[PDB]
Write a protein that binds this DNA or RNA. Structure first.
Ligand SMILES: Nc1ccn([C@H]2CC[C@@H](COP(=O)(O)OP(=O)(O)OP(=O)(O)O)O2)c(=O)n1
Ligand SMILES: [Mg+2]
Ligand code: NA
Length: 346
DNA sequence: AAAAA
DNA sequence: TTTTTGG
DNA sequence: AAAAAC
């Protein structure tokens, strides 16, 4: 009957009855990220996450009793929204010049907190003024970010994600016919949209060399068809992103392939290749959500004295690595009831 | 910013 | 009170 | 040797 402070001990489905509160908390968290207040940022992200798990809307302050991750500052914000349907705090952030510039600049692929801060201090306020500047030097990632901006800023829907899945699977089985391809991320959690389409690729019989060459073979095949708009292949190195071999792509998705102008759409696609025995850890890590993953690792450390990541699960007391053929086995090792992928939308 | 140590 | 917050 | 990419 007691709501846990850990997302991995909550069922969070896509039906959010508290969007008025969580949209405001998400804006306040984002501003704290920009102001480098990591602590206050994480407190607003946890409060937003717990409200997303509620099976009813908050309509009075009494409704917040017993809910964790809701301290005094957060309850003041909830009180203000109950008062007149708006957050004065979130409204002030939305009107702030630094906040507006950071949101706009980081909306470009290849632009993060550091580059957005640099451009703001240089006096830039619009993407048109940045792009047309003759002194600025752009990374290959930023050039692609600006060239395919309108397509990348529009969300990827389910017919588009499915069309991408078909392309990925048909390219992959051409070089590794026994390979298992799984769509991960938001779409695996039941989402109708996303900023990208992510896939986990694994093969039970492939060699170390075959496993290494698959992403190169698949991207060369797409490069030949003129479908590869951007490609960054990070070699495996198996504290940041995981060491598995991965690639961050922009693919040309022809309209004819989508069962739902220029006749195509630029789509952000990420592919991850992992060894067959680590497929459960990689699937769990790549399914998300971000908050679900954070709390899984926090719970493992603080409550079980275990260490979890996308590649393994280590027990510090028994001094052994724990092995798993499925996500269910990882949850069981952690002493957690199994949370379905569509229930991990924390 | 909130909860654990 | 001080420490931790995915790493 | 910094920045972005999850
Ligand atoms: N900081 C992060 C970012 C991502 N992930 C994991 C969970 C999701 C997976 C994919 O990353 P995203 O593409 O950013 O995830 P998303 O769930 O697919 O959100 P969206 O539907 O907008 O693409 O990696 C994580 O553990 N920590
Ligand atoms: Mg995604
Ligand atoms: Na960006």
């Amino acid at each position: 009957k007691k709501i846990s402070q850990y997302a991995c001990q909550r069922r969070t489905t896509l039906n959010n009855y508290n969007q008025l509160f969580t949209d405001a908390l998400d804006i306040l968290a984002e501003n704290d990220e920009l102001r480098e207040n990591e602590g206050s940022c994480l407190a607003f992200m946890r409060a937003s996450s717990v409200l997303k798990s509620l099976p009813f809307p908050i309509t009075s302050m009494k409704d917040t009793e017993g809910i964790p991750c809701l301290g005094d500052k957060v309850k003041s914000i909830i009180e203000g929204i109950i008062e007149d349907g708006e957050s004065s705090e979130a409204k002030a952030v939305l009107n702030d010049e630094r906040y507006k510039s950071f949101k706009l600049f980081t909306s470009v692929f290849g632009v993060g907190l550091k580059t957005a801060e640099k451009w703001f201090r240089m006096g830039f306020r619009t993407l048109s003024k940045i792009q047309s500047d003759k002194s600025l030097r752009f990374t290959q990632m930023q050039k692609a970010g600006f060239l395919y901006y309108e397509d990348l800023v529009s969300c990827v829907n389910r017919p588009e994600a499915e069309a991408v899945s078909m392309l990925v699977k048909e390219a992959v089985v051409t070089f590794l016919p026994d390979a298992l391809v799984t769509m991960t991320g938001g779409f695996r959690r039941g989402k109708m949209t996303g900023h990208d389409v992510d896939f986990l690729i694994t093969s039970p019989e492939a060699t170390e060399d075959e496993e290494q060459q698959l992403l190169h073979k698949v991207t060369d095949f797409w490069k030949q068809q003129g479908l590869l708009l951007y490609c960054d292949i990070l070699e495996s190195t198996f504290v940041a992103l995981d060491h598995f071999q991965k690639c961050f792509l922009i693919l040309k998705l022809d309209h004819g392939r989508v069962h739902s102008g220029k006749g195509w759409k630029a789509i952000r696609v990420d592919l991850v290749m992992c060894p067959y025995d680590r497929r459960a850890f990689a699937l769990l890590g790549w399914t998300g959500s971000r908050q679900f993953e954070r709390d899984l690792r926090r719970y493992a450390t603080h409550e079980r004295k275990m260490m979890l990541d996308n590649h393994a699960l280590y027990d510090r007391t028994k001094r052994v690595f724990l092995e798993a053929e499925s996500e269910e086995e990882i949850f069981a090792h952690l002493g957690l009831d199994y949370i379905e992928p569509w229930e991990r939308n924390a």
